[PDB]
Design a protein around this ligand. Sequence first.
Ligand SMILES: O=C(O)[C@@H]1CCCN1S(=O)(=O)c1cccc2c1NSN2
Length: 167
Amino acid sequence: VNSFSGYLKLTDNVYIKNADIVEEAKKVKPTVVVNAANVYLKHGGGVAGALNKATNNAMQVESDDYIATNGPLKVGGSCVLSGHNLAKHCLHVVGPNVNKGEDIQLLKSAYENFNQHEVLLAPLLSAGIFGADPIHSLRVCVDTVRTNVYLAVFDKNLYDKLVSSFL
Ligand SMILES: O=C(O)[C@@H]1CCCN1S(=O)(=O)c1cccc2c1NSN2
């Protein structure tokens, strides 16, 4: 039993809700919140920009030190950093950004990072300003993640389409 509330159950391990991931995180304080990161951990917009704003830019400060030490992530890769005031940890995951021409096949690799964590609060990878088809992102999530994932979808309209079209 966990404190995630109001989620629809899609499969044995995947749950979904219309919610602002920032407000979900502040309420639940999950062990892991997933960020929709880019390889430079530049948290400018979309989920990343919102999550960082909620940390008063502390996420960006920590991220800049990470990059200065380690260099950029790989597309499809991840790193674990602090969750600041939102969660114990933040798993920064880089899905392919279609608007940069990146290989959508890398979306499966991106979701594989979730399997290193027993429970996560997450957005759909490569959705929103990353330009991928969210119905496809949900499908890849369900077919790749085996650990317990709680998906927050910001747009109420989009949520209804994902539920109604879920096979
Ligand atoms: O729901 C949305 O408006 C957009 C468009 C498609 C998916 N999302 S999102 O970019 O992942 C996103 C951005 C900021 C906050 C949250 C989400 N999801 S949940 N909270």
